[PDB]
Structures are given as C-alpha cells and as structure tokens.
Design an enzyme around this catalytic site. Structure first.
Site, short mmCIF file in Angstrom:
data_model
loop_
_atom_site.label_atom_id
_atom_site.label_comp_id
_atom_site.label_asym_id
_atom_site.label_seq_id
_atom_site.Cartn_x
_atom_site.Cartn_y
_atom_site.Cartn_z
N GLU A 5 -34.67 27.22 29.26
CA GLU A 5 -34.31 25.96 28.61
C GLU A 5 -32.85 25.64 28.87
O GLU A 5 -31.99 26.52 28.85
CB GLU A 5 -34.58 26.05 27.11
CG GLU A 5 -34.31 24.77 26.33
CD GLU A 5 -35.13 23.59 26.83
OE1 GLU A 5 -36.36 23.59 26.61
OE2 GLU A 5 -34.55 22.67 27.43
N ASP B 235 -39.32 28.73 27.44
CA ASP B 235 -37.93 28.67 27.01
C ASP B 235 -37.08 29.81 27.56
O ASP B 235 -35.95 29.58 28.01
CB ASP B 235 -37.86 28.66 25.48
CG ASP B 235 -38.17 27.30 24.90
OD1 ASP B 235 -37.63 26.30 25.40
OD2 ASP B 235 -38.97 27.24 23.94
N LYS C 84 -48.94 25.04 19.00
CA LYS C 84 -48.28 25.57 20.18
C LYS C 84 -49.18 26.52 20.96
O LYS C 84 -49.10 26.58 22.19
CB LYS C 84 -46.99 26.29 19.78
#
Ligand SMILES: C[C@H](C[C@@H](C[C@H](C[C@@H](C[C@@H](CCN1CCCC1=O)N1CCCC1=O)N1CCCC1=O)N1CCCC1=O)N1CCCC1=O)N1CCCC1=O
Ligand SMILES: COc1cc(CCNC(=O)c2nc(Cc3ccccc3C(F)(F)F)[nH]c(=O)c2O)ccn1
Ligand SMILES: [Mg+2]
Ligand SMILES: [Mn+2]
Ligand SMILES: [Mn+2]
Length: 180
Positions: free
Chosen positions: A65, A93, A119
């Site tokens: 990220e 991420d 998620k």
C-alpha cells in the site's frame, strides 16, 4: 469546496500521507475536495498500514500500500515469483516474510465482524491474511493470528480512537460514520 473535513484531514495527518492519499484517490478518479470522507478514510488506512509495517522486525514487512498500481503489482509479482505464494486476485496491503503471506489491512467504522465477513467474501484467495481494526478499539485477524505484538496493535487502536475523538470534537464524526 471549502469543507471542514478537508482542512481537518490536512491538519491531522502527516503531509506525506496526505499526498499519498491524494495521489491514490486521483488515480481512481476521485476528488478529495468533495469526497472528503473517503479522503479521511484513505489517510487513516495509509497511516494504519504504515504503523503496522513499523511493528515487527526491520526486514519483516514488504509494503504494498502506498505505491501506484503498476509498481505495487510489480512488487507483488516479484514476491510471488520469489517465494511461490499464490497470486492474489486483488492488491493486498503488505507481505510478511516471517509468516510468508500477504496481509490485507482493514479499517472500519462499524463492528469488525461484518467488515471481516465482507473482506473475506470479496476475495477468494484463502492464503491472504486479513486484519481488521475498528475505530472503537476492536481488532479481528485470520485464524486468531494477529501477527504483531499487542503493543503495536494497541498503539494503532489508540491512534484510531484519537482520530475518532478529533472528528467528533468538530461535529464531523457522525457524517464520517454514516458515509461507510
Ligand atoms: C519513504 C517511503 C518509504 C515507505 C514510507 C514509510 C513512512 C512511514 C514509516 C513510519 C512508520 N516510520 C518508520 C521510521 C520512522 C517513521 O516515521 N511513515 C508514516 C508516518 C510518517 C512516516 O515516516 N517509511 C519511511 C521510512 C521507512 C518506511 O517504511 N514506503 C513503503 C512503500 C510506500 C512508502 O511510502 N517511500 C519509498 C519511496 C517512495 C516513498 O514515499
Ligand atoms: C477487494 O478490494 C479491492 C482492492 C483493490 C486495490 C486498491 N484498493 C485498496 O487497496 C483498498 N480499498 C478499500 C475500499 C475499496 C475501494 C474500492 C473497491 C473496493 C474496496 C473494498 F476494499 F472495500 F472492497 N479499503 C482498503 O483497505 C484497501 O487497501 C481494488 C479492488 N478491490
Ligand atoms: Mg492535530
Ligand atoms: Mn490496499
Ligand atoms: Mn486494506
């Protein structure tokens, strides 16, 4: 244009995190001047990812990220071709070299339960680890494996609640919570 939320985000977050969130939003065709709640959420998620990577060892986490899409995907490709882990369908991420697995960080304004449900339903790669933090101090990780020590996660939750308090002190927290 002149929104209170935008000025609060510029005053509350680090300038580099603000610039990274601005670039990430502009790469997807979003304006931080109007989508101020999403701007705050992106800044918060970036700061959380950075604090998370700060925990653990020095060479432990490879940070995905923050980079642009092309470089991020290149780094994931290199990690997959080096370690042999399956290629994830969506951009994660971080990558844990100690645990050798991709980590998806989540920051939600509601209960971590439904957020982790969504998620884990949106991605089908069962190898990717998921870690959700809430603005009230709750956390939820895959297989009850929270990766980091309790101190780093506690710092993350403290920062999240401080952000929530600063938002509420400006009468901006209710709209931010209803935006998600
Ligand atoms: C400079 C940057 C490299 C990193 C960014 C990240 C910054 C991060 C680290 C925090 C925690 N720490 C740890 C050391 C002290 C400190 O404050 N935070 C958040 C709050 C302020 C801050 O410094 N840092 C900087 C030091 C090492 C590191 O991990 N990364 C990884 C990919 C995306 C990204 O930005 N890079 C690299 C080239 C482009 C760019 O911007
Ligand atoms: C399945 O996630 C995705 C992810 C991508 C890659 C770029 N985005 C992110 O990285 C990201 N994005 C969100 C919110 C969001 C935004 C757009 C679409 C879906 C979502 C989410 F995660 F809620 F599903 N939060 C995060 O915490 C996060 O990291 C591309 C496509 N889908
Ligand atoms: Mg401040
Ligand atoms: Mn991400
Ligand atoms: Mn994430």
């Amino acid at each position: 244009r002149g929104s209170h939320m935008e000025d609060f985000v510029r005053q509350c977050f680090n300038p580099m995190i603000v610039e990274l969130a601005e670039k990430a939003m502009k790469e997807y065709g979003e304006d931080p001047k109007i989508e101020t709640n999403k701007f705050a959420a992106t800044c918060t998620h970036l700061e959380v990812c950075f604090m998370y990577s700060d925990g653990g060892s020095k060479h432990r986490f490879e940070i995905i990220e923050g980079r642009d899409r092309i470089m991020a995907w290149t780094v994931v490709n290199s990690i997959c071709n080096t370690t042999g882990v399956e290629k994830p369908k969506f951009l994660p991420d971080l990558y844990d070299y100690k645990e050798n697995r991709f980590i998806e960080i989540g920051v939600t304004r509601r209960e971590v339960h439904i957020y982790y449900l969504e998620k884990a339903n949106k991605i089908k790669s069962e190898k990717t680890h998921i870690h959700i933090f809430s603005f009230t101090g709750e956390e939820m990780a895959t297989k009850a494996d929270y990766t980091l020590d309790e101190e780093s996660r506690a710092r993350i939750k403290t920062r999240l609640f401080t952000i929530r308090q600063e938002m509420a002190s400006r009468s901006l927290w209710d709209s931010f919570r209803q935006s998600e």
